[PDB]
């Protein structure tokens, strides 16, 4: 039960599902690692305001609507990942940049 979604954009933001792996990550967007009863909101350092606001909405949906409330949403920042994220993805590499939005 693992999914990853990329949250990329500006004023129109898209949440697209992606491989569960560090390779999918970049330092400029937000990602949502669905871990069942725990949901990880991870935003790159160079994330924009919009992505982080939509990222929060995407998280809400999984908990409220796919996990019927039974889920905690943990917000973290590039370089300060929860031990549980590193357990799943292995140790984080120097992440590549994000593209234009």
């Amino acid at each position, epitope marked *: 039960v693992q999914r990853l979604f990329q949250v990329k954009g500006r004023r129109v933001v898209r949440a697209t599902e992606v491989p569960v792996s560090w390779e999918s990550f970049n330092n400029g967007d937000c990602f949502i690692l669905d*871990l069942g009863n*725990n949901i*990880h909101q991870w935003c790159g350092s160079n994330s924009n305001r919009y992505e982080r606001l939509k990222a929060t909405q995407v998280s809400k949906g999984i908990r409220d609507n796919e996990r019927d409330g039974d889920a*905690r949403v*943990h*917000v*973290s*920042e590039e370089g*300060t*990942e*929860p*031990e*549980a994220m*590193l*357990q799943v993805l*292995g*140790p984080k590499p120097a992440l590549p940049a994000g593209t234009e939005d």
Partner: nanobody
Amino acid sequence: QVQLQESGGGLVQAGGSLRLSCAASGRTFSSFVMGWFRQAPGKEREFVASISRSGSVTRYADSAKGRFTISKDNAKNTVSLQMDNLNPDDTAVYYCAADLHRPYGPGSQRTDDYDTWGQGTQVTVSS
């Protein structure tokens, strides 16, 4: 598979002290929130103290403020609980716990926020 193991419980007299420790084993990549719970005979599982990933912000149950001091050692990957001025209402099995999902702040007072636990240690304060 991070594991937890408690040590250092034992017997103590009403007024005495005791120090509990929890060693985290298995592969880890970073620091994490840890906490102490206890369970008395009859009674159910209750919070005692929890600490943030860095050891910087702590929280204490009502029974616990003043007498207990929680600290963390991140290279050792342990957690400690110093228990001063013990009375027999403190007699219980004391459990180590970890919240690997929390990225900042101490742990909460609920057990369901803790995902990793040890098998406990016995603490007996007799009057």
